[model samples]
Target: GIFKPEELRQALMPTLEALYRQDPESLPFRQPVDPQLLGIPDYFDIVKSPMDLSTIKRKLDTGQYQEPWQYVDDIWLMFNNAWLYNRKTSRVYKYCSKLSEVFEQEIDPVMQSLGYCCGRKLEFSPQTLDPELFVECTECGRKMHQICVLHHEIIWPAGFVCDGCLKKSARTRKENKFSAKRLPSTRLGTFLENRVNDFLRRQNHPESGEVTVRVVHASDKTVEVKPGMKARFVDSGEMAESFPYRTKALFAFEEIDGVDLCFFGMHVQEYGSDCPPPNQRRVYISYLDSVHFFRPKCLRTAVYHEILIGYLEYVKKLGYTTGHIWACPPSEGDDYIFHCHPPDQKIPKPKRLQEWFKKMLDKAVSERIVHDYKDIFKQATEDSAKELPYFEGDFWPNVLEESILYATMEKHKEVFFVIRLIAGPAANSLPPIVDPDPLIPCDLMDGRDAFLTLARDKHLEFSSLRRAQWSTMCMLVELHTQ
Candidate 1:
């Protein structure tokens, strides 16, 4: 309470200055903060000057709430270094603006690595943590950890580099070396996360880390299994500890699925250690999976999206390549649910749709549908698509959705895509029906369910339309087979 607003800022300035050195590129200064912990959360700021007991007493005295210090740390550390509390009007600093420099430097290691943005009052003291955990300076090659480290409050995303090194030897580092830049393969990943538990189960590998699972109550009893992104699950407290420093492996956290479900590996093994070559001989591959949603309701999805792209970039810094993916099975599910909306700009929608559809049509005409019925089916389907009112303007998604249907036709219903059941080697045993694949033409009656819904009234004419549509789809599947 005795400290002036100017004095608080001054005390914070030296702290921030040190943090700036720890992560020169983080936050950069004055750049607007999109959210806290880089997610959709409030900016942690102590509104009143000198939040002493007197000010605290009033808020606590009313009995509306209590325990100020316990609750304030998480919010405070979030906005503190980037924002400075000044007399009269608040001030915004303009020194650091990069996630690579900001995250771990400003955040507590336990909190950062465990994936959290909140903190406790005890966090201000260095003695509260394990002595072995520490960080090295990129510029000066200095070493320290947590609160004791003058710049410990600032964290870096790419990896922590000491401030002194950033100021001086930054340019001397090789540009494309695995040690210098963050790469996508370095961090945990989306696809690999899904397979870890299954792979371990099937291969009987050592349990390197913990995996998340959900428990549910059914009619007879409770069941435990994998859950959706937002499902509520119980933590048995046996979650795996983070891997040792420089150990490239998957790490799990409370809400990893919201941003990143898993991790790949890291480029730099240890802070202050030498950077590895881009083509270094490490044979390990870290795997990960994410279930990020881009819904209008949760604004954080976009922020999470940005964070993921950055993560992938950093992973690549360590020399991750698609060659590793070859060992893995197909990336998508069998049904491959079609989305009502097209994906964001990362996917080239227009050209892909055009090509895949053209291929489907050619395949249908050449193999599945009879030549005379082809024009009739094509013209009828075109007319049906236009019948809807919303089809007038920019109806690209509809086309894209259809292309998706035909592109992966065999993955869908066996009706439209042909399936033939044959006798097996043993008498009375039927072999699993092989598919024509994709959108191959089955018996006209086979895919009736797929088209019946479209026929709506179940009337003869719409049924005919549905049949034509089915024929068209089968044609596409036939193309994929060839």
Candidate 2:
């Protein structure tokens, strides 16, 4: 809402640009891709299986939050938000992921009906309802399952397909455990969820918002619904059909996306995958909308000066307290002028201003020079490379490119040094950049980019905590304002 509605149309920009940048007729990752024809390291092994999210505690180790993912170990973003990542096998795990069992079978049809019933009422597109699918596009030809829900009913006239395989690939991915004969949000479903929630709450503490419970089947044609008896709402059709597993005893509880349930809103998604798996799966009692960054965590640093001097001046003019001041002293004593403050007032440092200057003074020799990063770029020789945050979207490709370049230059010694000293591999070994097929979702580049961009930005600021490199990674992240 802050920008024009037209400005919000960036969601479709990628689609158009891809078409414009269409490679001459040759499609990438098409069906039956010949190994010899592919454009990356053809062989790699994943005896390491894959590195899951919980395993990465100090990916960057630079005092910033570390994002963990299935395949990417550490994302190295060079600039802007272009993310890059590598893996155990070097072959990028580039399949797709999904909300388990969703879009796999008949339940998919049920989800559509269910989503339609609710989405239509909310005037929301069913696409937004399914949080388990990949909402973006990757160059991968056939898609897997994962999708990011946008407000489009793409699965209606055209049913939901795996974003990776773009076909009914979810079935190949996982099985449906939670039945969708009735969608999760049905009036009856909601009532059951609420009722059991209350029962568990009171069973634990009358005031406690959340508690756990179990449902079971009774001996003779009876259902044992425990903790509390009645539901919070009559739930239009819920009570009328009550106690009926066709009138059999049974028990069950409500859960969201499986594991963590934000009963009455507890903690945020902060603890979900990022935190150690052993940590208690808590809820986000607050009203914060958190989402997994599909892939590369947002490492992009906002160029506070992108809009330039006018913007900062405007921020000063508006007297915005939120804006941070980076540097001070426009020009020592002479121009001790306050560009941000009023023009008429002399430098107002209370004690400093309290003392008055008597008369004209002679010029002082310039002892220092301060320049913005942009200035450095302008002053540099033509041969010098311009500094830009290194990255675009995904970083794995760049990493692979770098690795391959190393191999091409026959820097096998350097490669072996990293392998033996860094990667901890046998001196004779090199990992594959691309496997014939990958299991891990590849489009998850946002997290990678976010990591790299943020790391570099912090490093450039040289602000103690804001620094990262191959070394000092340990001291960097373990540090705080001690």
Candidate 3:
């Protein structure tokens, strides 16, 4: 025997005492082991070799032993080398010839009586198991239906996993789909957004209150705002300068409390409104209420700078073509900007034109610029007014009076002529300001010089393209000559 009598007693005797104390009915002993006779104390003491206590605890927790007596030998087998412990105890064990033989015989009869299927080596195949029957999951020890278990061989070949584990894998992908990660991650992308939001709120002049500011980009994938809702945004290609008066006569802005924030938008084609062609600048502002904006500098320039140049072009042409041709003739000042067309070509005013005009005039009146347009029209052009084919129905003096009032308001040389023009009907006859025009208005006096200089340089930059013929054209000319 590998274990001497002393060692055998030391190993088996402690387990025997524990079993006797806790589960005496499972043991064949008549009574609990006596500490005085066996000399084991109630509490354990230091021994020659310390065995891990958890090893025995784990088997007790798991139902590894089928019968109470089986515990006697099983503890020894689990703690010691299987071959050495069994062979060593073959002769020396006191309870039976060898503890291993007692366990084999005792466990088999008990297992058979308890209906446990047994063999020298147990083997299981999940595919052969019935789908209706329950099986233990290899990982969790929970009971599960055979059909719900995942298998390696068209069915469980050797090991089993339950539906709960399969669902765990699916939940990982579900979480991946909603990965709760948005908002800018980069340094520039985040801070640039702050810059744009600050710019918009300050520029718009909304009342001082806790307001929600949302800026949206052109490339956003999710959009809560739809077109044609109440809004107050300068469209991508629209100029924000005021019209002759605070007006949307030629441009539109809605009545403030009138949440339908009517706006004379930039070109509908440029903005991709869902409804196009038959157009108005109606847009939804609720969409902007929660958004934040940032756009690439180059892209913002590409979309908006050209529209600015268009307005400048309109103002540049004001003097001769559409502007004051013969300055200061009380007679000439009656040449108002609006005119009716000939019989064959007279298009009626657009829908809501009168209503829009009223709104502009109302705002102008509120500013006390003029009390009454008709009274001013009559008073200013009393003598020098003449009826023109353009305003087929105008009374002579009032016609000139309207033009004079406009001239007075158009005096903001520090602002672009667009300021007076976007007022809808106020600037109806105006052209877009082209380059080389006063970027702002120019006064008859020298006040416009600084602006005119910049206007000339800018105008030349854009017009230079139109003026120059390319080398390719020159080459073609030379080829024809040769």
Candidate 4:
């Protein structure tokens, strides 16, 4: 009864068609059997309840089947009849077996979606039921049969909790503990923190020693940021037990106004032998993890730029000679690109992102932080053409067109855009000096005065407007940001 009769028919017609079209050897099973014509006298005796595809279709057309399992049983009966009447070596027996497989493959998914188990409804007879199959509901303390649990497909490993109890408990919890106001900015912050911390843990690093937490204020509100470092030791086989110089990965996370705002990850390697000189070190900006804003109103300043500036300052102090970055924004499927905004918000497109990177690179060039820049994508295309002389036309344009689709396809091996940073004074570093003033300053009194002035100017034009209306307009301007 889960599906209407019309829906069942619609689901079954295609399955029947698939079986008929799959193999010509299955053609004999399409219609009812003629015992005399086949010269098998004992066919009726062996097949007590004879069934075939045509018979099942007739029953379906006449609306004889009340449940999907009834239709499934008829299909099994047809196969079982052939298996019993025909010998295992016979072509008929093999055809029935193959057709049975086809039927199961076609119908099992549809059956499962409609709450049946593997194309058949489970039996709940006393003899068939197991004592251990009963489980108690966690909240209501009611014992439930396996059938009931399987019906809803609830897998509560700790203990089975009925939906009735879950809903009631959820309602009370929602009213009390879950009623706190949630800031839109914190969604990406929590995600970044969890991701970075999880990555560190996965790399066999302990969180306590590797991570440092810091707190700062933005627009008179508390902001927290965590910056973590992970070191990797390389084995050069007998040159040393472990390489003397260490390669380090730095993860920087920023939380603005108590929400995660941005994340930056960089890999640092020393070039000189043994205890490498500070000037010989090179840093690679591995990832500038995407930060998606839910609403622009929540951000008091340019938090992303602030985090980048802080990271660049630290790297400059450490005195790395050169820096490298492969600027390839992740493809649409990658989790690095977050989407938390509503439909009305403009989605961050690849074109906009490419332009933003170009702007950043241009800024670095202007500031003398990057003395030389290289288009690795362009270089790769040229190399690829030379390596394969038969290849025709420009390869770079095709790569440019499909770059976003295959952004992270090379697993960080293929460079999209590479920039080389020259050692510069700390003052002329890549990170621009972020302005101290917030982008949209929060001045409640000034905002209120401006709104009132605008309202009054509009009111003056409408001379017919009443005094009561003017009073209401003034009262409406008394607004709060939070």
The candidate that achieves the highest lDDT relative to the unseen native structure: 4
The residue ranges of model 2 lying beyond 4 angstroms of the native Cα positions read: 1-141, 144-175, 178-482
Q: How would you order the candidates by TM-score, starting with the best?
A: 4, 1, 3, 2
What's model 2's TM-score?
A: 0.14
Give the per-residue lDDT digits (tens) of candidate 2, residues 109-228: 332331211111111112123222222222222212221221123212233334334353443323222222222232222333454444344445322222122111111121222212
| Deviating ranges (above 4 Å) for candidate 4 | 113-117, 120-482
Give the runs in model 3 whose Cα sits over 4 Å from its true position.
Answer: 1-31, 40-43, 46-99, 119-482
Winner on TM-score between 1 and 3 is 1
TM-score for each of the candidates: 0.21, 0.14, 0.15, 0.29
RMSD values for the candidates in order, in angstroms, are: 24.9, 32.4, 33.4, 22.1
The candidate 2 region of ten consecutive residues with least summed lDDT is: 356-365
Put down candidate 1 lDDT per residue, 169-251, tens digits, no spaces.
55432232211012122213333333334433554434233332210000111112222201322144332112112322222
Q: How much lDDT does each candidate structure score?
A: 0.27, 0.21, 0.26, 0.42
Best by TM-score: 4
Count of backbone collisions in candidate 3: 30
Question: Against the true structure, candidate 3 has what lDDT?
Answer: 0.26
- Model 3: per-residue Cα lDDT over 1-482, one tens digit each: 22234433443344444433533232323333344675545312323222222444444455444333334334443333323222444432233324334434444543333322210111122213211234564544544323222122222345655545547666311111111012112222223233333544555545211111111112111121222211222244232211121000011111122111111122110111221211111111110000001122223322222222332233323311121111111121111111111123222243333333344444434544323332222323331111111111113223344444334323421111111213335433544322231121112111223322432332211111111111112212222222
Better of 2 and 4 by TM-score: 4
Query: Distance (Å) between predicted and true CA of 405, model 1?
Result: 26
